[PDB]
Structures are given as C-alpha cells and as structure tokens.
Design a protein around this ligand. Structure first.
Ligand SMILES: Nc1nc2c(ncn2[C@@H]2O[C@H](COP(=O)(O)OP(=O)(O)OP(=O)(O)O)[C@@H](O)[C@H]2O)c(=O)[nH]1
Lengths: 388, 50, 122, 176, 61, 49
C-alpha cells in the first residue's frame, strides 16, 4: 500500500535543461556506477581506478567554491565496478573486479572533521567458484537488510547485513548468458535478471524460484534493467544497439513500449547502430513516466512515455541538429522514434562556447535532489558532471 | 529376459554417466565463457572509450 | 513431534513423509522422521510444499500475475519430483481449540513452572 | 457514478474446488481454452484462466480460478475463497468418495466465502456413464436441498461443460 | 563576486594543470596565473584526471 | 552423439572467444599508445599557444 519507488520524486514539470552545474574529474578511469543516498544527502561513484568516492550532493548546488569527493575509499583494490547506498545512508556496499565485496561505513562525522570510511564487513568471492560481482542492489525486508549481488558464475546471493547470513540464494542458468544487470520489484515480490545474451529471466522472490525465461529477438546484450514504475509486471531493459530502450511485460513476454533512437530502420534486427543506452532512470512522475537515458552516443535523452512528441535531448554536442520524436506502432510494439531533422555571422562574445557534454561513453546515470532536482552522469573517460 | 534387461540397463547407465559428465563440463564451459564474456564486454566499452 | 521448535503444539494440516517398508519409529531422535527439519538437506519439494501451504493460509503476499506463473512452476516441480521420488505422504491434521471464536495454542509447560550464600547456614 | 471499463461490464471471480482427481482442471481447460487432455498434472496452488462473455447484452469477464485438490497443498484456512463471487464445487461421478466429500466443501464455502456466494455443484466425469455412481436424483435431492444450481458435465465429451459455466455466470448475474 | 569567480577560475585552471600546490595562494590572482602560464609548469597541457585539494577548497570558503 | 557435437562446438567457441579478447587487448593497448601520443601533441600545441 505504501509503494514508494523514490524517496524524493522529481519536482512537478521537471525538464532537465542540461546546464552543467559541477564538473568533477577526480576518477582516473571509467566510472562504473552512480547511486544516491536514501536521505539524498550524498551520492557515490565507483571507478576502474580502484577507488570509490562519496560526494555530498548538497555541496554540488554551486553554493560551495570547490566540490571534491567528501570521502575516498581505496582499500577494496582492483577495479571498483559498482556501489549502492543502503537504507538510511549509513552503509555503502562496494565490489571490485578481484571478486572482493566489502561494506564500508560512511560516518557522517560532525563538522569540521571529514567523514571516515572503515570496512565494517568483508566477503571475498572465490574467483574460481563465484567470480566477480556483475551487479548489486540492496533491499531491506524490514527484518533483514539484504544486499543482492550477482556473480560471474551465475550466483545471485542476498547477504543480510543485519545477521551476516545469506537471506536467499538464486542460481541463474548460465545458458541464458552472463548476468549483466538486475532489477528488484518495489513490492519486493520478484526480481528480474538481464543477461549478456539478451535473455531476461524473471525470478519470484516470494517463492525464490525462476518462473520464466525469455530472450530478445535480436539476442542483444541487456545493459540496464529497471522495474516499470507504473506496470507492475513490466521491466524496462535498454538493449545494446540503436539506443533502444524497450519495456517488456514479463507475464506475456510482449514488448509494450520501445524507444528507437537509431539510424537503422525502426525495430530493425539487421546491422544495428553502434550507439547504445547505458544508463536508465525511470520515474513515475505523476502518471506520465519519464525515462532519461544516456549512453555511448554521449547524449542524455529524456523520453516522455506519455507525450513522446515532447521528448528532448538534455545534454549533448552543441552542434547537434534539432531532433523530433514521433510515435508509431510497428509490429505491435508502440515505438517512439527519434528522427534527426536535417538542419538547413552571429557575433560571439569570446571563443566559441566549449561543449559541456561528455567526450566519452556515459557509463551510468543517477539522480539526486537537494533544493532542486539534479541528474548526475559519469563517463568512461572518468568525468562525472552534475546537471540541473 | 533378466540377462537382456541387465545388459540394456548397464548400457543405459554407462551412457547416462557420460551424459552427466558432459553436462558438468558444459556447465564449466559456461562459467569460463562467462569470464571471457565479461572481458569481451569490458573491452568493447574500453575500445569505444579509447 | 507434537510440540514445535518453539514448544507450540502443532496445528492445522501437516503432510508427513512416510518412510517405505519401515514401522514408525518412536525413539528420540526418530529414525523415520516425518518433518525433515531445515538442518538437513532442504528438499525442494518440502520447501515448496511449505510455501504452497503458507500461501494458501494467506501468510504470503498474493501477486496474481506471479501466482499463475509461480504456481505453474511449482506444479512442474511437484510433477517432476513425484515421478522420481515415489515416496508416499500421509496427511495428519491436529484439532484446533477455540473459545469465543479465538484460537488457542497449547504450549508445553510444567505444572510447577511458575539464596546461594548463607551467613549462618554453612 | 464511478469509473468503469468497456472490456467487461462486470468481472465475476469464479472458483473451482473439489477433491483431487474430480476434474477441476479439465473444467477450466474445457471452458476457457476449449482444451482437453488425458494427461493429469495435479494442480498446485492456483491457476487463473480468463474468458470474456456477454450475457443479457451486458458484458461479463469471467476469471475462473482453479484450486488445489490434493490435500498436501491445502490448509484449514484458505484465502482463495476471499472475495470470490461464485464458487463451483465439483465431484467425479465415478468416485463415490469424491461425491461424499461435497458436504465438506460446502462446509469450506460457508466458512470462508462471500456470504452470498453462488454455489454450483457440477458433476464432472459425466462421460463415464459406464461408471457413474452418483446419479442425477441422488445429487439433485442434495443440491435442491441447498438450492444450489446443479449440472452434470463432461470435459471429455465437452458439451455439458459449456452449460456449467453459463449456469454459473447466469446465477452470478442474477445476484449482480 | 566577480573577483571570487575569477580566483575560483584561476584555481580551477591550476588544478586542471597539476600546478604545484605549494606555489598557489587562494587570494593571489595574477601570481597563481603566472605560475600556471609559467614556462616551468611541467604539467601545463596534460589531459587527465585532477583532484581539488581540500586545503585549497577550504581556503576558498 | 548430440552432446559430443555440442561439446565440439563449445571447444571451438572457447578458443574463438579467447582470440577475440586477445585481439581487443592488443588493439586497446595500441590505441592507448596513440592516445598517449595525441595527449603529448595536444600538450605541446597547448604549451606553444
Ligand atoms: N472421462 C473423463 N475424465 C476426466 C474428465 N475431466 C477430467 N478428467 C480426468 O481427470 C483428470 C484431472 O482433471 P483435473 O481438473 O486436474 O481434476 P482436479 O480436481 O483439478 O485434480 P487436481 O487438479 O489435482 O486438483 C484429467 O486429466 C482427466 O484425466 C471428464 O470430464 N471425463
């Protein structure tokens, strides 16, 4: 009855203008994930450089002269691929490419002392038996605060951080592909695992059994999975190529809504476009779910599933020609296609305005809200930019 | 009849033992492939970045 | 066992695994246990059977779309297990006690259940 | 005034219950999917087929839940009856035990179901005339003693089955 | 505000070019620029990650 | 017989997948070296400007 998808929904009519607020280039390698704290006071980013950095979201509002990572954890070793905040902002989970998963506590020490991060619990996965963590999410069943993470050997294990025991254990069929991402239902009844072979496998968490396995017609890799904010049985999976973000109803397996932002013919299974969606954010808004997607095309696109005609590019290359979005039904899937409108001196104060967009693949997308709603995006070149 | 049944059962058991061994090897291949597949996905993202 | 792990007398319908070709054993611990505790190998059938019952009583969240698929999956598991594990299950039901429409649980308690240093007494 | 949908003017939750091996699954398959098989998979938990019908020009979406007939999937409480609009009690005309237990199911319905629930005794396996052991009058005295609708049906020799679901819908509509 | 912004911009540039933090003064506008555009700045022109020193961040506050 | 044919295809797939990773690793290293040169060129051109 109290279904909350987000602790802080975006302000009504929130349309990100793409104005760069803070340019953070502290990471030495590709940023793998972005997460926001439950209180929205902090957000964290992990990178291949082996460091996890926690940032004060309130400080990115421009009120502070210099915004740098509030805390730097580097004791995990290897390449830190993903991180997630745990309910109440008191715990931070991290994973490394060595197979080590450690939960570090971010102590909100009173000013002026800087918060200290210390490893509270540690788990070392056997590189031969479990492998490294591919994706990780945390959900609290009230009695047990369980961090669910997926390994290379197909083991999805939920470690209950309260009792240190495994709350539940699922074994994915590796024939369905390598686990690439997963989503857990807001109602905590079920979870869906996406794979590298394009298989979307549905798992019922109440019974802890795999119920159905479906494969994308193109077999393209699933990049990010999210539960649909409105449809209780729909999962939004961004697939490799054509910047396609498709929403599938797992009960029937039919693709209900699909975004086709590629130069290939819509729904084309042949020679896909090398742009792909990397980050997916779904907010119910207030009945018209909005999805912000950013990927290898270096563009952050806001697709409005209710009024596709109003979708627009938040941030991208300054010279990007104007694009229009049209709604069309193709092969039974409602597909909104991005059509590049063929663009057919003004005095410039100073040099040509520098491009504010990212210069490399945007690897992940997340949002945080302080006085205003902000979108934080990180790129594979190691630059994290916070946009309003 | 018993001798023939025993012979057929022995052949079925031998063929089944090979099937279980192949199934375990196939599972191991999927594990190793998963490690190579993670690397392939990592390299494709790395290559595009470079 | 007539008393549960928490001393509460068993209630409702309970399906007890019948060990073939052996008389019921009363020694403690029983050699022919009917309720395989969670400490031994978790029989996927036994765990799912407990879950199906927990669902029937309304102790599990009902998700209509998930139920049709999940229960269909349970049906496949139970059908597959019935073909390989030919074990029989005997159902026994214990009576329930009600007063003023409220159900009461019988808990094992002894009738008599309700100075280390002396100054003078050595 | 209230929000309503054109896909169904009314939605009736039906519910099939009855001992194991009576025919609860085959009734559902024969009504919803015009399907039959001799291959028996013992229903566990719940199943939820759909058929949409028009009756008296009003549109009724039937939602026709199966239920477990094995005891080992059954419990003293049962939440499945909750919110049910109709209940269908089934017995196998070749299985006297499955017939006798009909009173036990009516004990279940009266304890848990909606207070006005339309019952309907359906004598499945009515194709088994070679083995019928509960006969029309034998059931009709009982059914008429409760005033529950009654029919005899076969999902094998389908035709009786159709009238069983039509009857349930009719008796529901009379309440709705 | 304009001078503060300019000083912030100079400091930000100094950080981006890995200028020797011991030579940078948060209030010295042209002095920081002179070290930045100094021919002796070994890191001027690098393309890579950079960190903003907490002491320099705190000194601006 | 079907399992053997699958096993043969898997052996081919393992060597094939190993080669694809090796090619990408060398190509990435090479593009990293060219990138290092590009950064040096940019640095020198910037320093001149
Ligand atoms: N001859 C005949 N056999 C039937 C008929 N209906 C069902 N059966 C047989 O009985 C079997 C079980 O039907 P079900 O609907 O599953 O009976 P049930 O009460 O649901 O059994 P459970 O699902 O285990 O509860 C079918 O597979 C058929 O073998 C019928 O109308 N005529």
């Amino acid at each position: 009855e109290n279904a909350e998808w987000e602790s802080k929904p975006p302000p009504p009519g929130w349309r990100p203008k793409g104005l760069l607020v803070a340019h953070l280039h502290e990471h030495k390698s590709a940023v793998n994930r972005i997460r926001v704290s439950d209180e929205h006071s902090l957000f964290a980013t992990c990178s291949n450089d082996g460091t996890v950095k926690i940032w004060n979201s309130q400080k990115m509002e421009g009120k502070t002269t210099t915004t740098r990572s509030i805390l730097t954890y580097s004791r995990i070793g290897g390449r830190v691929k993903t991180l997630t905040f745990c309910q109440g902002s008191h715990y931070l989970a991290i994973a490394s490419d060595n197979g080590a998963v450690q939960l570090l506590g971010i102590e909100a020490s009173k000013l002026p002392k800087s918060p200290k991060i210390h490893p509270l619990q540690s788990r070392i996965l056997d590189q031969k038996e479990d492998g490294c963590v591919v994706d990780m999410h945390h959900f609290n069943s009230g009695a047990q605060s369980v961090l669910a993470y997926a390994t290379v050997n197909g083991s999805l294990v939920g470690w209950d951080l309260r009792s240190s025991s495994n709350a539940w254990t699922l074994k994915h069929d590796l024939k369905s592909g390598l686990i690439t991402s997963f989503a857990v239902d807001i109602h905590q009844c079920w979870l869906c695992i996406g794979t590298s072979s394009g298989t979307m496998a549905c798992w019922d968490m109440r019974f802890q059994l795999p119920i159905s396995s479906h494969c994308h017609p193109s077999r393209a890799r699933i990049r990010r999975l999210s539960m649909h904010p409105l449809y209780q049985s729909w999962v939004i999976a961004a697939v490799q190529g054509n910047n396609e973000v498709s929403m599938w109803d797992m009960e029937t397996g039919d693709r209900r809504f699909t975004l086709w932002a590629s130069s290939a013919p819509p729904l084309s299974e042949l020679q896909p476009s090398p742009h792909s969606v990397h980050g997916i954010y779904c907010s119910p808004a207030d009945g018209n779910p909005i999805l912000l997607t950013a990927g290898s095309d270096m563009k952050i696109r806001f697709w409005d599933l209710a009024y596709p005609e109003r979708s627009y590019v938040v941030a991208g290359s300054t010279s990007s020609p104007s694009v229009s979005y049209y709604r069309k039904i193709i092969e039974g899937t409602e597909v909104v296609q991005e059509i590049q409108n063929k663009q057919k001196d003004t005095p410039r104060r100073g040099p040509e305005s520098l491009p504010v967009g990212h210069h490399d693949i945007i690897t992940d997308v997340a949002t945080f809200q302080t006085t205003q709603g902000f979108i934080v995006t990180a790129s594979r070149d190691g630059i994290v930019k916070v946009w309003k | 009849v018993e001798k023939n049944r025993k012979i057929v059962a022995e052949n079925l058991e031998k063929v089944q033992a090979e099937a279980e061994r192949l199934d375990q090897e196939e599972a191991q291949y999927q594990r190793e492939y998963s490690e190579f597949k993670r690397q392939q996905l990592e390299l494709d993202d790395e290559l595009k970045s470079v | 066992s007539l008393f549960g792990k928490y001393g509460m007398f068993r209630q409702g319908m309970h399906d007890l695994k019948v060990w073939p070709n052996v008389e019921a054993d009363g020694s403690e611990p029983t050699k022919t246990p009917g309720r395989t505790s969670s400490t031994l190998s978790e029989d996927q059938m036994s765990r799912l059977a407990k879950l199906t019952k927990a669902h029937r009583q309304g102790h599990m969240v009902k998700v209509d779309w998930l139920d049709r698929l999940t229960f269909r999956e349970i049906e496949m598991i139970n059908e597959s297990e019935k073909r390989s594990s030919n074990f029989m299950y005997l159902m026994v039901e214990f009576r329930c006690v009600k007063c003023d429409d409220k159900e009461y649980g019988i808990v094992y308690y002894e009738k008599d259940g309700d100075l280390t240093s002396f100054e003078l007494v050595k | 005034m209230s929000s309503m949908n054109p896909e169904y003017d009314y939605l009736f939750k039906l519910l099939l219950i009855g001992d194991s091996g009576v025919g609860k699954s085959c009734l559902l398959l024969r009504f919803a999917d015009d399907t039959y098989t001799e291959s028996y998979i013992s229903t566990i938990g719940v199943d939820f087929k759909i058929r949409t019908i028009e009756l008296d020009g009003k549109t009724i979406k039937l939602q026709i839940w199966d239920t477990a007939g094995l005891e080992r999937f059954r419990t003293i409480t049962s939440s499945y009856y909750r919110g049910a609009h109709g209940i269908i009690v089934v017995y196998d005309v070749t299985d006297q035990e499955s017939f006798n237990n009909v009173k036990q199911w009516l004990q279940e319905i009266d304890r848990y179901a909606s207070e006005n629930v339309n019952k309907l005794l359906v004598g499945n396996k009515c194709d088994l005339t070679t083995k019928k052991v509960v006969d029309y009058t034998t059931a009709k005295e009982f059914a008429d003693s409760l005033g529950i609708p009654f029919l005899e049906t076969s999902a094998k020799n389908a035709t009786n089955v159709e009238q069983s679901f039509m009857t349930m819908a009719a008796e529901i509509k009379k309440r709705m | 505000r304009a001078v503060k912004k300019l000083n912030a911009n100079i400091l930000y540039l100094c950080f981006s070019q890995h200028v020797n933090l011991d030579q940078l003064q948060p209030l010295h506008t042209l002095r920081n620029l002179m070290y930045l555009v100094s021919p002796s700045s070994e890191h001027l022109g690098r393309s890579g990650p950079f960190e903003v020193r907490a002491d320099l961040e705190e000194s601006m506050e | 017989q079907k399992l053997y044919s699958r096993a043969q295809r898997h052996q081919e797939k393992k060597e094939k997948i190993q080669r694809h990773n090796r090619k990408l690793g060398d190509l990435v290293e090479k593009k990293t070296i060219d990138l290092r040169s590009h950064y040096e060129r940019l640095a020198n051109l910037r320093r001149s400007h």
